[PDB]
Design a protein around this ligand. Structure first.
Ligand SMILES: COc1ccc(S(=O)(=O)N(CC(C)C)C[C@@H](O)[C@H](Cc2ccccc2)NC(=O)O[C@H]2CCO[C@H]3OC[C@H](O)[C@H]32)cc1
Lengths: 99, 99
């Protein structure tokens, strides 16, 4: 679709067998999801935003469905206040900015 | 123009007579610029991000030129790690996410 920005650009995702809502976030290099149950290996990581830093777990080659579009990539899991789909996955679904 | 997301979507802005670079940020409701000198009056405001919160100064009705598109709106100024243009100004320049 084309999505305008008068509202938060929220979309439905499916990951780890679960349905969630997430914000399409061009301001985010990586994808960060709130605490959820994901299977498999992970790695400790620390990531920074506006107010400081958080600790997350890094899952690689995770299948995620974003507004119907499948992508496979790194997903970070941790105490983010909002589920964030970052450019690492946005490029995979062909998402662009336009004005 | 159309902007893809393989790299940070950075653009040139002009605000308060000064030239700066800023990230087009669909994940940001508001616009937040690093500490810079802006003319008139402002109001205290607290904003939350991934790792906590910061104090910013709220400037209303500020003229900003974003990649050659003029907009007038609220700009927050404070200790953000990156200049970020939020949806409040993105809607003004007609910016969309799409295909
Ligand atoms: C009240 O108004 C506002 C409230 C919160 C924000 S917010 O904290 O900045 N923010 C609000 C969201 C949290 C809902 C927008 C989000 O896109 C932010 C802007 C930002 C901030 C600092 C540095 C780079 C980019 N992206 C974000 O925090 O990124 C993290 C997580 C994802 O991967 C990384 O890539 C950049 C950064 O280093 C990492 C902005 C405005």
């Amino acid at each position: 679709p084309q999505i305008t920005l008068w509202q938060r650009p929220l979309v439905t995702i499916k990951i780890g067998g679960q349905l969630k809502e997430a914000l399409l976030n061009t301001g985010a290099d990586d994808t960060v999801l709130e605490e959820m149950s994901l299977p498999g290996r992970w790695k400790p990581k620390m990531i920074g935003g506006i107010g400081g830093f958080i600790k997350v777990r890094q899952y690689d080659q995770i299948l995620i469905e974003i507004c119907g579009h499948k992508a496979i990539g790194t997903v970070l899991v941790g105490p983010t206040p909002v589920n964030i789909i970052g450019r690492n996955l946005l490029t995979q679904i062909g998402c662009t900015l336009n004005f």
